[PDB]
Amino acid sequence: VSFLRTEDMVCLSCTATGERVCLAAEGFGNRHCFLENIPDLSQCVFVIEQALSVRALQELVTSGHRTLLYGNAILLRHQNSDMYLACLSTSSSNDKLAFDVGLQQHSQGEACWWTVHPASKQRSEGEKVRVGDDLILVSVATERYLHTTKENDLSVVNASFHVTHWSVQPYGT
Ligand SMILES: [Mg+2]
Fold first, then answer.
1. Using CA atoms, how far apart are residues 93 and 126, in angstroms rounded to an integer?
2. How close is the Cα of 61 to the center of ligand 1, in Å?
3. Is 54 left (phi over 0), alpha (psi -120 to 50) or beta?
4. For residue 105, how far is its CA from the centre of ligand 1 (angstroms)?
5. CA of 154 to the centre of ligand 1 (A)
6. Which segments of the chain does DSSP mark as H helices, in order?
């Protein structure tokens, strides 16, 4: 029916212990991402600011109203905070092999870029991303999946070598 585009406003959602949740962030404090179970969800809103071939991404690190192709690297701006969904440098509590995921105060480097990949055989690289598709998000910097799981039953969010499927839902009409 409909295709993901740059400048679109979205929530990222997954199923955590049966429940539906969205990837949320605050913009102050530690700025670590977190999950809110689903006007009253503003911190769960990201803007797809840029999408590029990884060739272009690597070119730039040394757009428009454009449609997302699987394999694209995308730049996700947190609306409230004007910051960017990023892979952090510090390691996750309860998995030494994961990285924390939070907000980075600027849009520089690779830690704020995520490649998009099919969460099923029903799609292949280079195809248009459809609203409603389930996504796999791989950090460009640390080659880990944006991933969600629990520790002492508390759904946490990190970048690790285990995969989560995310569903990109549009915000607003
Ligand atoms: Mg900005």
1. 36
2. 16
3. alpha
4. 9
5. 31
6. 54-60
Resolution (A): 2.5
Place of tokens 């598709």: 133
Which has the closest alpha carbon to 120: 74, 66, 166?
166
Sign of CA dihedral 22, 149, 141, 88: positive
Which residue type sits at 93?
A: S
86 beta partners: 102
Task: Kindly list the domain boundaries of the chain, sorted by start residue.
Answer: 1-173
Comparing CA positions, the residue from 171, 156, 162, 146 lying closest to residue 10 is: 171
Method: X-ray
Token pair listed for 112: 């704020």
Distance CA 48, CA 149 (A): 24
One-letter amino acid for residue 169 of the chain: Q
- Tell me the C-alpha distance between 125 and 118, whole Å: 7
